[PDB]
Amino acid sequence: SSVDGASGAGQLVPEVNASDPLAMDPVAGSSTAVATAGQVNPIDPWIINNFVQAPQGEFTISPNNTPGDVLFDLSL
Amino acid sequence: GPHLNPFLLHLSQMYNGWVGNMRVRIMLAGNAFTAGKIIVSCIPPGFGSHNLTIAQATLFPHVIADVRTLDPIEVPLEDVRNVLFHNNDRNQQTMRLVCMLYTPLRTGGGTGDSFVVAGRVMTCPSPDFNFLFLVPAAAAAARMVDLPVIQPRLCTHARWPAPVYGLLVDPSLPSNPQWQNGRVHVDGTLLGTTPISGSWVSCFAAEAAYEFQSGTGEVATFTLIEQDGSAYVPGDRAAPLGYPDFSGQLEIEVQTETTKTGDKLKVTTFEMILGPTTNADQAPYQGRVFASVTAALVDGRVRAVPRSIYGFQDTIPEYNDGLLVPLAPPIGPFLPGEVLLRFRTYMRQIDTADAAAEAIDCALPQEFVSWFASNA
Amino acid sequence: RVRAVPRSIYGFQDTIPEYNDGLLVPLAPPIGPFLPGEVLLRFRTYMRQIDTADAAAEAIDCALPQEFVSWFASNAFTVQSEALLLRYRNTLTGQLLFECKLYNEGYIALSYSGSGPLTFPTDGIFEVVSWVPRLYQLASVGSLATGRMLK
Amino acid sequence: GPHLNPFLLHLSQMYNGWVGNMRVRIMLAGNAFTAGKIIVSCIPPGFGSHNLTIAQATLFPHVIADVRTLDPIEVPLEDVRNVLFHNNDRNQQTMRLVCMLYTPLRTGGGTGDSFVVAGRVMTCPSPDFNFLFLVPAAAAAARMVDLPVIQPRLCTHARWPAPVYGLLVDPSLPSNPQWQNGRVHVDGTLLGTTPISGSWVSCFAAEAAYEFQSGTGEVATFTLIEQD
Amino acid sequence: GPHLNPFLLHLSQMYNGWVGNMRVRIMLAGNAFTAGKIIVSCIPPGFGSHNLTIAQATLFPHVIADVRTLDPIEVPLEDVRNVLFHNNDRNQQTMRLVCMLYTPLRTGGGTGDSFVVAGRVMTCPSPDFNFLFLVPAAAAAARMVDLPVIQP
Amino acid sequence: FTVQSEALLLRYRNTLTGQLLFECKLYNEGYIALSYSGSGPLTFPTDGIFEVVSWVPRLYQLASVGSLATGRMLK
C-alpha cells in the first residue's frame, strides 16, 4: 500500500523519524469492560489494520503559519 | 474486461464468456528533482460512481507511489465475482481502478512550469484468464449517415428552379404540405415526381401540336414525355419527373428540343393552368396537358421551363382529372410543438401592372435530394 | 439588391470571359491530360440562342452533371490511385455500352478514334470499377463491326 | 494458410509469421443409391496452376472417396516448406488441395435429375501450428468511392441551368476546355467558381444602380454579392 | 428447459426453477434413395438472435449427419450457466440447439415427390437435472376475448 | 371479459374470399379506430367479418393501408 520514494528520493530527506519513546505507560483495552458492559462487540478484522484517512484527515503547513499554530486537535 | 487489451477484445467476438485476472502497470516519467504522490484504489463492483476524497480513496485496497519511482508500478486487477464467470453483458460490473493525485506535484530547480509528469498504463492477462465458449465468428453491418457541408444559400431549390435564398419555420403555414418534388427518404427512396437534376424542377417536355376542338388553334396540346427525351408512361407517381406540384397559372417558355448543333429552334410563351378547374381538361398523370398561347409557332418535340406564376397556391394540381392518383404522402407527422424547417426561394409573380417576389418552400435542397438518392 | 438569371445567349463562344480586366486571375486548370486516343466525355444541354429573326438551340457541355458535383463535394471520398474505371450500363436491358476512365481530377475519358461526334443513349447508368493507374488502356468505342471469322 | 480459418485469419493480423499443419475434412451427402468417386490430390508448392487429367491427379499423393461414404474424409494439409517458417508474403507458395470428380455421379432409383451430391469442406489447425512474432495490432483505413445510379437524362446540367439532354464525345471540339463551373475532384475538392446548387449555375446576385459616365442611365452597374 | 420433455413440462408447473443437462436424440432414417445432411449446432446463451448461415453454424460446436442414418443421433444439451441455477422467468437465457438443413434433400429412384423425410426428436433428462423450489402448481391463465363472426 | 391492456388489434376480413380489408383498434372503452388521412368519407364492404388480434398498447400504430398508390420507383 505505502510506497515512499526512498528509491528515488536520493538522500536529501530522512526516511524514518528518530525520536525518544513516549514518556507514558501502555494502557489497557477491552479487558476492563468485559465484566460490566452488557456486550463486548467485536469489529471487522479488516478495519483492524487498514490505516485509513481520518475524517480530520488533512492539514497544511505554510510559511504563513507561526509556531504554536495548531495543525490538528484529535480527541480519542 | 477484454476491452482493455485489443488482442483479447478481438478474441471476445469468438467466445461468449470469460473469467480471469489482468495485471496492471503504471509507469511515470520523472526526475530526481520532483516530488508528489499518486494513489490507485481498487474499487469493487457494486459500489457506485460517486466521487471520492483522497482520504476516502485510502479506505480501498490501494497503492500510493511517489512520482520519482523509476520502476513500473504493478497492481493486480482481480476478478472479484459474484457469479462463476462472466457472460458478455453490460449488466456485468467489474473491478475498477481509479487513480488520483495524492500530493501536489512540486518540481524544483529552475522550475519550468511547462514541466509535467507523464503517465502510461499497460495491462496483460495472467494465466488465470480464459475465454469460455466457442461461438460463431465476428462481423456485422452498417454503417451510418452523414450530410454534405454545403450552406443553404449555396444550394439549389427543389420545387422552383432557383437558388435557395431563405431558411425558416412558420407555424401559420400549412403544417403538413403534400409536396411531390423534393421528396426523398434518408435511405435514398425517392418519392413523388422528385427528379435527380435540379434543372428538371418545375419543367416538362412534350410533343406539341395544335388540335381544333374550339377550332381557333391558340391551344397547344402537349403529349408529355420524360425530360431526358424518353417516353412518359402513366405509373406509380403523379406525372413526369419534376412536373410542377403546385397550382395557379404558370407562364411557360417552350422551345424546340436540342438534339444536335444546328437544330433550328422555335420559342413560344404560353400560360398553362395548373389547378383543378373545371369541366375542365388537363391530366399530367395520363400524359396530356394544354396551354394557350398567351394570345389571350412551335410543335414537334419541345421543352417547357417556368417563367412566372399568377395566382400561386401551394396545393397540388389536379393530376388525374378527378380520379385517384399516386402521391407521396403529406409531410409529417410532427410531435407536439415541432414545426417543418423550410428551404425557401422566390418565384416571379405577375401581374398585370406589377411583378413581385412570391415565396415557395421545400423540405430539403436538391443537393440533399441527390445526396440521399446516391448514398442509399 | 437583385438576382440575375440567364435568358439566352448571342454569339456564344465556349472560352472563358475576361474575369479580371487583363490581369492574371485564379482559374481551375484546363481539363486534362488524356492518354493518346482518349477524349473527354461530354454532358450536354442547349441554350436558347437568339437572333434577331431566329432563336435556335446551341450546345453547351460540361464534365459531370451537377448531381455528381454535389455527390463528390459531399462524400469527400479518400482517393487511392489515379483514376477510376467505370462501365456505363443499361441496368434495364443489362447492356454494357462502354467503359471509361474517371480521372481523380473530375473528368471522364473514353478511347475513340473517329472524327466524328459520337453520341450515347442517355438512360444510361455509371458504375465504379477500380482504380486503375493513369496509363490504364480502355477498350475503345465508335469501332465498328468487330466480329471476325477464321475464314 | 491462416486465411482458411477466420479465427486464425483474425489472429494473423497480430503476428508476423507462421508454420504448421492444418487438418482437412470433406463431407459428402449421399444415399446408398448413388455411385461415383471424387479425388483429392495434394499439390506441392512450386508446381504451377496448369490443368490436369484425372489420370494425372492420381500421380500426386491422393485420396479417392466413393460418394456413398458417411464418415468425413480427413486429409492432412501438410506444410511443405523450403524455409524454416513463413513470413506474411504473397511470394510464399503453400501446399495445395485440388479436388476433382473421378467417376461420374450415377444415381439410381426413379432418378430425380434434380438430385446432386453436396460437399462441405472444413479445416482446423493441428498442435504443430504456431504464429510467430507479436507485432502491433490490426486496423487500417479506407474506404472506396461509388457513384449514384442516376441516368444522365434525369440529371441537372452544371454550366447552363437546364436538364442534361445529351451524352457524347467529339474529337473535333476543344480537347482541353478551361471550364470554371462543374469542376470537382473525386476527393470532393471543388474548383473554380463551381456552386453546390444547380439553381446557381450561370446566375448572379448584385446591388444594382445607374451611374452616369456617358450620363444616359441605360447601363446598370452591378456590385456583385454571392447568390446566398 | 423442462419444456423439452412432456413429463418435465408437467412437473414444471409445480416447481420454481431448475438446473441440469438434457439428452437429445434426433431420429432420421430416409430411404436408401435419399441423400442429404443436416447440421445441429449448440448456441451459447448470451449470443442473441441472429440469422445464421450454414457456414456460421460451423463456428459453433456442431454435429453433422446423413439423413439415412439408422440409429438416432444423440446430442447432449449442456446447461451453460452464468449463475448457480435457473428460475421460471423471462430473464433467463439458456443454451440452444439449432438444427438446419445442411445440404439439399434429393430423393433418387422413382422419386415420389410426396416423399419428405419425417424426423422425430426425443429427450430425457440427464441425472444432473433437478427441479428446485416447490410452488403452487398452476398460474397459466389466458382469458382472451373474442368477437362473434356476424357481418355488419 | 377480463381486459389485459388498452385496446385490441382487429382485422376485418372477407372469410369467403379470404381477403383482409383492413386492420383497426378496438379501444377497451368500446369504440373502433382506423388510420386514414383522406378527407373524404371512405366506405367499406359490409360482408365483412371482425377478428381479434392482440392487445396492443394504446400507442400501437395501425396500418393505414389505403393510399393504394405506392407512387414511386426504384428498381
Curated annotation (Swiss-Prot), chain D:
Region annotation Shell domain: residue ranges? Answer: 1-136
The similarity comment for this entry is: Belongs to the caliciviridae capsid protein family.
Q: What is this protein called?
A: Capsid protein VP1
The species this protein belongs to is Norovirus (strain Human/NoV/United States/Norwalk/1968/GI) (Hu/NV/NV/1968/US)
Swiss-Prot record, chain E:
Give me the ranges of the annotated region Shell domain: 1-136
What range of the full-length protein does this chain span? 86 to 221 of 530
Q: Identify the domain of life.
A: Viruses
Q: Which residues form the signal peptide?
A: none
- Please give the coiled-coil regions recorded for this protein: none
- What organism is listed for this UniProt entry? Norovirus (strain Human/NoV/United States/Norwalk/1968/GI)
> Which protein, by its recorded name, is this?
Capsid protein VP1
State the family it belongs to. Belongs to the caliciviridae capsid protein family.
